[PDB]
Amino acid sequence: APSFPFSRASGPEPPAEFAKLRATNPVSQVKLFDGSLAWLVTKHKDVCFVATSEKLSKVRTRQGFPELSASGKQAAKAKPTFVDMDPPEHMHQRSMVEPTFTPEAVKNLQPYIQRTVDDLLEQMKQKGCANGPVDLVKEFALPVPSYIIYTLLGVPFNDLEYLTQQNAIRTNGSSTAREASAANQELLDYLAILVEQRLVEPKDDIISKLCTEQVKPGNIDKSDAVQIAFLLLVAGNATMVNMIALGVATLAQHPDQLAQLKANPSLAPQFVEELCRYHTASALAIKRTAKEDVMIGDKLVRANEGIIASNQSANRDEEVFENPDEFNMNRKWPPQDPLGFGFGDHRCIAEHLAKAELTTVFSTLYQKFPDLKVAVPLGKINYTPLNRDVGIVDLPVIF
Numbered sequence: 001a002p003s004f005p006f007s008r009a010s011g012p013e014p015p016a017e018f019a020k021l022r023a024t025n026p027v028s029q030v031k032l033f034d035g036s037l038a039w040l041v042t043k044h045k046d047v048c049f050v051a052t053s054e055k056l057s058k059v060r061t062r063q064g065f066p067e068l069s070a071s072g073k074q075a076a077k078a079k080p081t082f083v084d085m086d087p088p089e090h091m092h093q094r095s096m097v098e099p100t101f102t103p104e105a106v107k108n109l110q111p112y113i114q115r116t117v118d119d120l121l122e123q124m125k126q127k128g129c130a131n132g133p134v135d136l137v138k139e140f141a142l143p144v145p146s147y148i149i150y151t152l153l154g155v156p157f158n159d160l161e162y163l164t165q166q167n168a169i170r171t172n173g174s175s176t177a178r179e180a181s182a183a184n185q186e187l188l189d190y191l192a193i194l195v196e197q198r199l200v201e202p203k204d205d206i207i208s209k210l211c212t213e214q215v216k217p218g219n220i221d222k223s224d225a226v227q228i229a230f231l232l233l234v235a236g237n238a239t240m241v242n243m244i245a246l247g248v249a250t251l252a253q254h255p256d257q258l259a260q261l262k263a264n265p266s267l268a269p270q271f272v273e274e275l276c277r278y279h280t281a282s283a284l285a286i287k288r289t290a291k292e293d294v295m296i297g298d299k300l301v302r303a304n305e306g307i308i309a310s311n312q313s314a315n316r317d318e319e320v321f322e323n324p325d326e327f328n329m330n331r332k333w334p335p336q337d338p339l340g341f342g343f344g345d346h347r348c349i350a351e352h353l354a355k356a357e358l359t360t361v362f363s364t365l366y367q368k369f370p371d372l373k374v375a376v377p378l379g380k381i382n383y384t385p386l387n388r389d390v391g392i393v394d395l396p397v398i399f
């Protein structure tokens with residue numbers, strides 16, 4: 001059994017292993033860092049099965065759970081939030097914060113999302129680049145999702161820049177173990193204060209709603225509110241930043257489609273759909289342990305055995321998406337759901353918000369900067385470690 005996670009073939013490419021597995025061994029065993037084994041699912045149909053099977057669990061205290069790293073095993077000890085819960089606990093807590101993320105709520109949030117993007121682009125414009133290139137990530141990809149989630153949670157405007165920087169340190173590759181944890185602990189400390197404040201004087205934000213609707217009635221306690229808010233912050237920020245960066249690099253990679261997007265920003269929604277399929281920036285979250293024996297394909301996964309379902313591989317499944325390795329914003333979509341945001345009960349709570357942010361970004365970015373260009377040969381782009389989720393660390397641009 002090969003060691004997993006696999007390493008991406010190249011900077012922007014998915015691991016080479018998946019294609020081969022989908023064709024010759026769709027359901028196989030891989031070896032994890034601690035030597036334990038797990039079943040790796042690579043076909044779209046099987047990934048969907050794993051994501052929805054009631055015979056599988058997300059509880060990490062169950063023996064056999066596929067932890068992919070030393071730290072993962074440690075994190076599994078703390079009290080769990082809905083991300084690691086099975087029904088009915090899962091929705092009992094998730095429904096506590098779902099209102100802000102419904103399709104309707106997000107549609108009503110559009111103007112706010114637009115102004116957040118406009119202001120960041122304007123500040124990046126006046127800041128100019130007359131003395132050289134600027135980092136699109138630091139100046140744009142990072143603050144867009146950061147300010148929005150922080151604002152929705154209840155963070156005041158003046159604290160956004162500092163908190164955005166601290167949250168970045170949390171996952172930054174250059175950060176030392178000490179720097180990462182301190183930034184992490186600091187964010188938790190800040191959230192604790194916000195909860196205390198909103199418990200006293202509630203405002204129109206997520207933290208205040210948890211405080212009034214769950215904490216006060218005694219449904220959850222303060223630390224719970226802090227952890228739930230923390231999850232909403234760290235769960236998808238790094239991914240959002242990587243998706244925006246990856247989007248810009250991809251458009252530079254395919255000039256003709258960038259030409260098309262500029263000419264018709266109305267194509268943004270479909271460009272975002274193809275981007276979330278082509279670049280599956282979160283491919284290691286659909287994990288489970290079998291509660292009882294379950295047959296998947298030609299294999300029998302026995303009780304207490306772990307399973308990793310690659311939504312990244314599923315998104316390149318040639319049986320579902322024709323010419324899967326071709327990025328095409330004008331792609332003819334099949335009836336099957338691309339899985340950039342997972343599937344089933346646990347499907348990304350912020351899928352609609354994430355798409356709205358991305359759609360706003362790519363329907364506006366080139367309108368503001370028609371001549372935006374990556375200020376460095378594409379083959380030299382600084383991507384994330386090949387053994388981690390796909391993404392871009394920094395992206396020098398000129399406009």
Ligand code: HEM
Nearest residue numbers: 083232235236240282285340341342343346347348350354
């Ligand atoms: C383009 C950006 C994003 C992508 C591609 C993405 C993708 C995903 C994926 C693959 C999952 C796993 C779903 C499953 O278990 O089947 C997930 C879960 C989750 N995401 Fe995101 N996400 C994004 C943005 C966000 C944002 C902005 C937030 C926060 C507001 C967020 C919050 C969460 C949470 C809390 C979960 C756990 C849901 C649950 O287990 O019930 N995501 N996301």
